């Protein structure tokens with residue numbers, strides 16, 4: 050709405066019931082207060098599809114979505130007894146993970162969600178969830194800690210026991226230190242079930258409360274801070290979607306700073322501007338102003354449909370940026386079994402954009418022309434020439450140098466699905 | 480085994496001949512294609528060529544009459560060398576072109592191929608319609624790409640080493656239940672009507688594309704998307720006829736964005752595309768995969784080739800139809816020196832010229848190395864195949880090298896080199 054109202058993106062494996070859980074957080078904030086959705090929750094709950102553990106009113110909503118991809122229509126949120134929360138809910142094998150990173154807000158805190166159990170630990174120790182690439186995109190700028198919720202802590206055979214939770218905390222906490230991040234002041238955990246609740250209030254008698262003394266999830270988020278009176282830092286707005294009516298409609302979060310009705314907004318990628326005809330907040334709407342951390346549905350007066358696409362960011366003329374086509378980069382490859390040959394197709398992961406990329410040629414290695422061996426990458430000698438490459442993609446993608454800012458300028462590469470490399474764009478070319 | 484890719488110099492070769500025949504560019508209206516089917520008789524054609532000569536003789540307009548008599552008299556002159564139509568038929572190409580090297584010599588091709596039946600062509604127009612042997616060894620359109628999504632659809636085609644996308648639209652189906660009152664349920668009904676309108680509009684534009692004139696242009700047709708937006712496409716009333724019948728694969732993709740989409744076509748092949756020329760899968764990929772294994776299993780273009788080919792040690796050879804490498808002969812004495820399609824130094828390797836000795840190092844000529852690899856590979860116990868740069872990997876070959884790469888049988892080591900330490 051105005052400011053202090055989070056940036057949160059769920060991440061987790063697709064199986065993790067993360068959409069059920071993110072729906073239960075959206076599900077009428079004020080707590081219960083719901084003369085229509087109490088009637089919907091009266092059983093409705095599912096066919097075999099998302100399947101059923103109580104958390105639902107939302108699992109049968111995947112059913113009809115047609116489905117297998119996505120349950121929380123790249124959409125939720127709520128408020129608590131502190132602040133408002135956006136939500137944005139990673140993949141059920143969707144793209145809502147793209148939707149965060151370069152899209153809707155740089156989380157002050159993400160969230161990781163994991164589902165400890167027999168057939169879930171197996172697919173959770175593969176570990177290749179909508180955590181993985183899906184926190185790296187997520188980290189081309191910022192998004193971290195995330196807490197971690199340990200879902201599925203009632204169905205399996207746990208029957209409200211007091212075990213497995215710590216065993217998962219150890220394995221998950223070596224999995225967050227990987228790559229090289231920060232400490233553990235920012236890596237608490239919360240047991241949940243999606244099945245029921247727990248994380249918003251401790252007013253359950255669950256069977257965790259006989260042993261668990263600590264704050265709830267929201268209290269371990271609320272250890273950050275607030276602000277006040279909107280209009281604080283620079284204005285930014287990522288597009289989740291576009292369609293048109295009288296004027297174009299766009300949907301998306303606001304990243305920082307302010308939108309009122311009847312301001313100009315600039316879209317740099319296109320090179321156009323518009324007046325916003327209206328703003329919808331995110332909660333109970335009555336014609337009021339918004340804040341980084343709610344969305345806005347907006348109406349757009351005097352621009353075309355084509356002029357904006359999802360994953361772009363709007364700002365004021367004041368604190369803006371720029372971007373171009375193919376490019377040169379200094380990429381650092383890890384240990385992988387495969388070598389990148391000159392031209393090879395990887396998937397890039399800048400931002401919202403995951404796209405196929407040809408690494409056409411190899412211009413220099415440590416200092417030589419050769420295939421991209423460099424398993425542990427730079428010239429070990431003076432200036433770290435990991436490799437210098439040229440990357441080419443299907444359509445011109447909005448990217449800048451890392452030197453102006455490290456966001457748009459960093460990206461990961463992965464061949465199949467093992468992350469071969471990371472780098473920075475050095476220079477722009479047509 | 481299938482020789483796939485081995486086939487691809489040969490396919491290519493035909494193709495000049497199809498363009499040069501059809502084109503005959505040379506101006507003048509004196510080009511005769513005569514194809515005579517197996518078991519037809521040769522003088523029924525000789526007598527038609529003589530009845531046309533006698534008519535051609537009435538034109539009496541010196542240039543035009545001389546073209547058509549020169550054209551008929553050339554095909555007639557060749558037809559005499561053949562006794563009968565042989566088994567498999569006769570093809571004959573005759574006509575006066577803008578020949579080069581002021582050496583003249585109208586085109587004269589006369590041969591027996593393998594099996595063009597009942598085609599029986601005699602035309603002297605701009606084009607000979609040689610067809611149905613050309614239909615028979617079809618090569619058409621290939622694989623059909625139809626992409627659902629919740630945001631919008633896509634139609635395209637991957638055809639050999641031709642991928643084409645260029646025909647799409649989008650939808651906002653109604654996903655916004657609306658807010659402000661009303662109801663609950665109402666949206667879900669509005670949702671199922673507007674999704675039915677996409678099941679009509681995607682399937683109809685797919686009928687308006689892929690099934691061209693009274694038959695599907697494409698051999699095969701893949702439905703790709705997510706979350707049963709395609710299963711309600713495939714088992715439907717609106718889609719069916721003759722297209723439901725063709726569907727090879729139903730591929731599940733992620734965020735559906737182009738990578739997912741490609742991986743889609745990819746997994747696909749294997750038993751579909753068919754022929755044995757264009758598609759490769761299982762074979763192409765093996766070539767690339769097997770080199771990956773730091774099993775130095777590559778020849779790829781620019782350093783090791785002829786030598787290894789002379790010395791057994793190659794499973795499958797990967798060459799391109801557009802190769803800018805050849806063989807040259809003439810240099811050094813008491814023996815022979817061989818030149819490869821001369822690069823920045825090969826073209827002017829005149830340096831090898833021992834002026835203070837005589838060693839004449841004059842950059843040979845020009846021979847074609849493409850055709851030789853398609854006529855030898857059994858003696859070496861190896862193989863040979865061909866491809867194109869029509870793609871990411873393709874463009875690597877040109878920049879990294881020229882157009883010739885090999886696939887050592889089993890794990891051999893990257894050929895040592897000075898640069899290597």
Ligand SMILES: Nc1nc2c(ncn2[C@@H]2O[C@H](COP(=O)(O)OP(=O)(O)NP(=O)(O)O)[C@@H](O)[C@H]2O)c(=O)[nH]1
Nearest residue numbers: 063064066067068099119120139140141201204243
């Ligand atoms: N026992 C148990 N099962 C759960 C829980 N949450 C989800 N599941 C199961 O896991 C399946 C997948 O959950 P889901 O949240 O849709 O995964 P997702 O892929 O992250 N969702 P999305 O891709 O839409 O974000 C569901 O069909 C459900 O049966 C939970 O807390 N406990």
